[PDB]
């Protein structure tokens, strides 16, 4: 049901924190 959340987290997770910090 949920492996979309896992695939997004595992491939965009370290992007996401930098994206929040104005694309660091």
UniProtKB/Swiss-Prot annotation:
InterPro entries: Antimicrobial_frog_1 (IPR012520). Expressed by the skin glands. GO terms for biological process: defense response to bacterium; defense response to fungus; killing of cells of another organism. Transmembrane segments: none annotated. It is found in: Secreted. Its main location: secreted. Belongs to the frog skin active peptide (FSAP) family. Brevinin subfamily. Antibacterial activity against Gram-positive bacterium S.aureus and Gram-negative bacterium E.coli. High antifungal activity against C.albicans and a strong hemolytic activity. This is Brevinin-1BYa. It comes from Rana boylii (Foothill yellow-legged frog). The lineage of its organism: Eukaryota, Metazoa, Chordata, Craniata, Vertebrata.
């Amino acid at each position: 049901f949920l492996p979309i959340l896992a695939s997004l987290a595992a491939k965009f997770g370290p992007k996401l924190f930098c994206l929040v910090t104005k694309k660091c």
